[PDB]
Amino acid sequence: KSTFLTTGQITPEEFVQAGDYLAHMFPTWKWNEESSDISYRDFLPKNKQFLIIRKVPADERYYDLYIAYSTSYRVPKMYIVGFNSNGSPLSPEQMFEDISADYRTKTATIEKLPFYKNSVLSVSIHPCKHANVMKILLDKVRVVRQRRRKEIDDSLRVDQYLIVFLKFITSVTPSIQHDYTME
């Protein structure tokens, strides 16, 4: 029915599914709570607009990572907000230091969190080629399970989509200390 292993793309309903699972397997990740500061999208539940993780350490530095849903590319899109140890907001050229050079120059931009009425500067990873990446990563995971089994139902389910997405993001943000381990 779903073509997500074929397209690397998710629907809004599937985004919510993968988010719930991510929030379950890793409770450091939480859905947004309802707030008047939030610019709501009609195509998502009010309490399931975007995913938040708080103060992930770097190097000191700390990051709030946000996972929103890109409607144009039907993929998740990430936003990072950095802070110094004293809690002072980091600067765009500081935040660029914590992003892989090659991937930084090609995908990263500075913009406010689009889901907040109140302006909060962040670094935006453009999701232009996320679908192609996920398409490859999901099938690669499948091969690993295929080899592990050999000692078809090895393909992942869609609510596991975001964990694969985060494993991808972690590689692009190495200094940010978060990792996602399964099996």
Author numbering: 19 to 77, 166 to 257, 277 to 308
Which text from the study accompanies this structure?
Many facets of autophagy rely on the autophagy-specific ubiquitin-like protein (UBL) Atg8 in yeast (or six LC3- and GABARAP-family UBLs in higher eukaryotes, here referred to collectively as Atg8-family members) and the E1–E2–E3 enzymatic cascade that links Atg8′s C-terminus to the primary amino head group of phosphatidylethanolamine (PE) lipid molecules. The central enzyme in the Atg8 lipidation cascade is the E2, Atg313,24. Atg3 receives Atg8 from the E1 Atg7, to form a covalent, reactive Atg3~Atg8 intermediate linked by a thioester bond (referred to by ~) between the C-terminus of Atg8 and the catalytic Cys of Atg3. In addition, Atg3 displays unique, functionally important structures: an N-terminal amphipathic membrane-binding helix (N, residues 1–18); an intrinsically disordered flexible region (FR, residues 85–159); a handle region consisting of a helix and a disordered region (HR, residues 237–282) that contains an Atg8-interacting motif that is dispensable for the lipidation reaction but plays important roles in vivo; and a flexible extreme C-terminal extension (C, residues 299–310).
To illuminate roles of Atg3E123IR-binding to the Atg3cat, we determined a crystal structure lacking these interactions for comparison to the prior structure of full-length Atg3. The structure of a version of Atg3 lacking the N-terminal 18 residues and the FR region (Atg3∆NFR), determined at 2.5 Å resolution, superimposes well overall with that of full-length Atg3 (0.48 root-mean-square deviation over C-alphas). However, there are substantial differences in the catalytic Cys loop and adjacent regions. In the structure of full-length Atg3, the catalytic Cys234 is sequestered in a pocket formed by side chains from the HR and two loops. This orientation is catalytically incompetent, with the Cys distal from the structurally important Thr213 and from two other side chains (Tyr179 and His232) that are important for the lipidation reaction (right). By contrast, in the absence of the Atg3E123IR element, Atg3′s catalytic center is structurally rearranged into an activated conformation through a domino-like effect that ultimately results in remodeling a loop observed in full-length Atg3 into an additional helical turn at the N-terminus of the HR; the remodeled helix cannot restrain the side-chain from catalytic Cys234, thereby allowing the alternative orientation where Cys234 is surrounded by additional key catalytic residues (left). Moreover, it appears that the extreme C-terminal region of Atg3 also rearranges between the E123IR-bound and other states: this element undergoes a conformational change and additional C-terminal residues are visible in the crystal structure of Atg3∆NFR relative to the prior structure of full-length Atg3. In the conformation in Atg3∆NFR these residues would clash with the bound E123IR, although their nearby location also suggests potential to positively interact with the E123IR in an alternative, presently unknown conformation.
